């Protein structure tokens, strides 16, 4: 075995937009990771259908970065709710190992379709 991140990670909360300051209150299940040097988010999920931008607040509050996203992917989930659709995003420049980590954890801990 070479495996893909046994010990998992924790958390998903905050905001998003489409043109810079379009992030108003909260439009993202911005997912995972509070690293040892500080909070560094990995994955973004969107109950909406089209977003190019987000703004995650952290530590100082004054430092909250206007992140550039990437073209999305879509899937349906096997939640107890039933029909639930989001459009998946990753923060741009996210290397392959991190996407594998979040995809594996999301698929193996919670049920999807």
Partner 1 sequence: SADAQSFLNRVCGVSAARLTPCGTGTSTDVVYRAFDIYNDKVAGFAKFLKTNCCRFQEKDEDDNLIDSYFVVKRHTFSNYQHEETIYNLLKDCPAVAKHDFFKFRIDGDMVPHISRQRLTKYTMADLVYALRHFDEGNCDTLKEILVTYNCCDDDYFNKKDWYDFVENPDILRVYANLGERVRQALLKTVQFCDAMRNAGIVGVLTLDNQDLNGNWYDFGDFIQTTPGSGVPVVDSYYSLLMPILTLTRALTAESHVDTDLTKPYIKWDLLKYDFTEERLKLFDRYFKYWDQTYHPNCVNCLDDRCILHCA
User: Which residues make up the interface to partner 1 (CB under 8 A)?
Assistant: 1-4, 6-7, 73, 75, 88, 95-97, 99-100, 103-104, 107-108
Q: How far is CA 106 from CA 6, 39, 44, 47, 87, in A?
A: 13, 19, 12, 16, 14
Query: H or E stretch including 100?
Result: helix 96-109
Residue among 82 and 93 whose Cβ is closer to partner 1: 93
- Phi and psi at 60, nearest 5°, equal -75, -25
Q: How far is the CB of 42 from partner 1 (least distance, A)?
A: 13
Residue among 23 and 42 whose Cβ is closer to partner 1: 42
Angstrom distance (rounded) from CA 18 to CA 74: 18
Residue among 62 and 109 whose Cβ is closer to partner 1: 109
Q: How far is the CB of 87 from partner 1 (least distance, A)?
A: 12
Label the pairing between strands 85-90 and 43-46. Answer: antiparallel
Q: How far is the CB of 15 from partner 1 (least distance, A)?
A: 24
Q: How far is the CB of 3 from partner 1 (least distance, A)?
A: 6
Angstrom distance (rounded) from CA 60 to CA 104: 31
Residue among 2 and 21 whose Cβ is closer to partner 1: 2
């Amino acid at each position: 075995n070479n495996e893909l991140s046994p010990v998992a990670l924790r958390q998903m909360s905050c905001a998003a937009g489409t043109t810079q300051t379009a992030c108003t209150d909260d439009n993202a299940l911005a997912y995972y990771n509070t690293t040892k040097g500080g909070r560094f988010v990995l994955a973004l999920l969107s109950d909406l259908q089209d977003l190019k931008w987000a703004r995650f607040p952290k530590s100082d509050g004054t430092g909250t970065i206007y992140t550039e996203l990437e073209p999305p992917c879509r899937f349906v989930t096997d939640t107890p709710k039933g029909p639930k659709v989001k459009y998946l995003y990753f923060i741009k420049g996210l290397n392959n190992l991190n996407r594998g980590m979040v995809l594996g954890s999301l698929a193996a801990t919670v049920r999807l379709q």
